[PDB]
Design a protein around this ligand. Structure first.
Ligand code: 170
Lengths: 11, 276
């Protein structure tokens, strides 16, 4: 149930 | 400037429970933290799946302290590497992406104490994480201080209270916001007599005795978080311990065990000036 974080950090 | 919170010490405002700590210098059963109450609180976030991994603390603009078992623990098949995790600083809400407040940083390198004992009792449960790039401080992001020999000697005494914070379980129940609880340090003999686990000088335990009425303890997900104390000498917050282990959560007769930060400062210093 975690809110999606920006893709800039996931990349 | 470590240990001075932008929203409290810097403005000469006190949080609602620090007085309790001061009066003693002579997360289960906790409460919601106040905004900016623990600016050094760090959340170790796992990329896939996106979930809470552990707590941690900010000790400088580029270094984060946590518990070794948060990254390496063979019994539970845990062996995370740099790219498996993210560091979320300045947070309050557990699950929400706090836009314009929190800062997510990537890991450059992980350093686990060479003599960390995961096989037996989590002796030397400590690890350092170097961030790829410096995190900018703010009202919600600020480093805590590390104790020196004198600070440890004067504050690490049975009866003296410390503060533990984390987004871990509320019962042995996920919190909406960062939780906090103040707990008294317990005499070594009592800590030893409460468990069959072998205790070392690299740990200390804390929590209320059954006859003390009050309760509280860290729980799953709080590991790696800070156990801090506010020095009555210079009014700065010092991280004296790291949430390490316990048998269950908040059980009568049991206590939480924390990594003795000062005892391992030699290693911390060595790592920081050698690789950082
Ligand atoms: O769970 C952990 C870490 N952790 C791990 Cl990795 C293994 N065994 C734990 N408890 C069982 C034990 F026998 F003691 C113990 C201690 C050391 C080594 C092996 N065992 O077997 C333990 O607590 N930390 C979270 C935590 C910290 C505190 Cl300070 C208090 C409670 C808890 N929690 C313990 N379980 N959930 N939360």
């Amino acid at each position: 149930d975690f809110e999606e974080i920006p893709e800039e950090y996931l990349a | 400037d470590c240990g001075l919170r932008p929203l409290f010490e810097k403005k000469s405002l006190e949080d609602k429970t620090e007085r309790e700590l001061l009066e003693s210098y002579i997360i289960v059963e906790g409460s919601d933290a106040e905004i900016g109450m623990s600016p050094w609180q760090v959340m170790l976030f796992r990329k896939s799946p996106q979930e809470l991994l552990c707590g941690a603390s900010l000790i400088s603009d580029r270094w984060v302290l946590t518990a070794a078992h948060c990254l390496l623990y063979p019994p539970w098949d845990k062996n995370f590497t740099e790219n498996d995790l993210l560091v979320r600083i300045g947070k309050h809400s557990r699950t929400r992406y706090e836009r314009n407040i929190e800062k997510i940083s990537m890991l450059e390198k992980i350093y686990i104490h060479p003599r960390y004992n995961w096989r037996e009792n989590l002796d030397r449960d400590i690890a350092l994480m170097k961030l790829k790039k410096p995190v900018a401080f703010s009202d919600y992001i600020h480093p805590v201080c590390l104790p020196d020999r004198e600070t440890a000697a004067s504050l690490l005494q049975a009866g003296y209270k410390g503060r533990v914070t984390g987004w871990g379980n509320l019962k042995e129940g996920q919190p909406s916001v960062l939780q906090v609880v103040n707990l008294p340090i317990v005499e070594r003999p009592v800590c030893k007599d409460s468990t069959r686990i072998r205790i070392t000088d690299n740990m200390f335990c804390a929590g209320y005795k059954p006859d003390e009425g009050k309760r509280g303890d860290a729980c799953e997900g709080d590991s790696g978080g800070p156990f801090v104390m506010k020095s009555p000498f210079n009014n700065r917050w010092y991280q004296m311990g790291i949430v390490s282990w316990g048998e269950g959560c908040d059980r009568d007769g049991k206590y939480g065990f924390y990594t003795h930060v000062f005892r391992l400062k030699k290693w911390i210093q060595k790592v920081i000036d050698q690789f950082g």
